[PDB]
């Protein structure tokens, strides 16, 4: 699989963070789907970004966060704004790559503790 590396705790007073998830895998011309989840459970998607790495595909949040982002050969950097102290927990970076096969995800990250203060 693809192994993810994240900083082990970010700590925030801006109420805003920039959180890059370094992979061991070149996402250059690959169709993929990169995500980030809040929770020990990992059961809230904070951003998806997905599409072909060719045409710069748009980050967004169903779950309700102000969330841009920028993708690069081996890195995926999320950008969360407007975060609350209510919302300091762990965040898990996560890729699936669809094309070209074979289709693979990533071995589960350690996560970062985002601590918002």
């Amino acid at each position, epitope marked *: 699989k693809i192994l993810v590396k994240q900083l082990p705790r970010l700590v925030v007073y801006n109420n805003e963070v920039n959180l890059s998830c370094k992979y061991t895998y070149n996402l250059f011309s690959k169709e993929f789907r990169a995500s980030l989840y809040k929770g020990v459970d990992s059961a809230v998607e904070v951003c998806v970004v997905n*599409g072909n790495y060719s*045409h710069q*595909p748009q980050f*967004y949040s169903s779950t309700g966060f102000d969330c841009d982002g*920028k993708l*690069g*050969n081996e*890195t995926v*950097t999320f950008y969360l704004r407007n975060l609350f102290v209510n919302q300091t927990d762990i965040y898990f970076c996560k890729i699936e790559v669809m094309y070209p096969p074979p289709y693979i995800g990533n071995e589960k990250s350690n996560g970062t503790i985002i601590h918002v203060k």
Partner: antibody, heavy 113, light 113 residues
């Protein structure tokens, strides 16, 4: 079914009125990619107005384009809209919708005022 | 607010003559990403513009190997390796690091009997 952006027709509008200009997206997924809007006055060059987030809706505007210009989406019919308001002769140009990494652009939609 | 600048508004080549087109920058457009955030564009006349290079070095689909994007991370050049008559037009560089995005001035690439 090549990817293909396709935009509203030409406009001849006189000052102090509304207009929406449509851009209809085809061939490709759509809410996965962002959507820029780009002004080109006639003998001058290209200017970036901003973009709308096809999933989230949220538009960002370039500073000069702040007020009176407005972007918006019918997301299930794959179509985006610029709407310009209280129009001023300033605002005559061809107007480009574009997406997919600025790799696919529209026809162009020529407004005159 | 980044200001892009092509210092070469018009440049007459003859065919076969290789040319290279500069576009300098206020900030550096390199990123922790490792990528560097420049598009290069060609608006042939009447035509909508078409993406040619993206992330400085990389060139998009349906574009000739003639075209090359080279770059120091605040100064950048588009080598066109051997000018085909088709390739004449205005070329626009465009930074995409920080909002607002900003286009160059253009550089008309005139072609001459």
């Amino acid at each position: 079914s090549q990817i293909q952006l396709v935009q509203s027709g030409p406009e001849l509008k006189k000052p102090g009125e509304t207009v929406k200009i449509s851009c209809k997206a085809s061939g490709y997924t759509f809410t996965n990619y962002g959507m820029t809007w780009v002004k080109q006055a006639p003998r001058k060059g290209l200017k970036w107005m901003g973009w709308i987030n096809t999933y989230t809706g949220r538009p960002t505007y370039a500073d000069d384009f702040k007020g009176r210009f407005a972007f918006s989406l019918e997301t299930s019919a794959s179509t985006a809209y610029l709407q310009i308001n209280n129009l001023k002769h300033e605002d005559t140009a061809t107007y480009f919708c574009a997406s997919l990494g600025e790799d696919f652009w529209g026809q162009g939609t020529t407004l005159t005022v | 607010d980044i200001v892009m600048t092509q210092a070469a508004p018009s440049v007459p080549v003859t065919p076969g003559e290789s040319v290279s087109i500069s576009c300098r920058s206020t900030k550096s457009l390199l990123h922790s990403n490792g990528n560097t955030y420049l598009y290069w564009f060609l608006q042939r006349p009447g035509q909508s513009p078409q993406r040619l290079i993206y992330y400085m070095s990389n060139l998009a689909s349906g574009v000739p190997d003639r075209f090359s994007g080279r770059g120091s991370g605040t100064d950048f050049t588009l080598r066109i390796s051997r000018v085909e008559a088709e390739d004449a037009g205005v070329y626009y560089c465009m930074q995409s690091l920080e909002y607002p995005y900003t286009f160059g001035g253009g550089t008309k690439l005139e072609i001459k009997r």
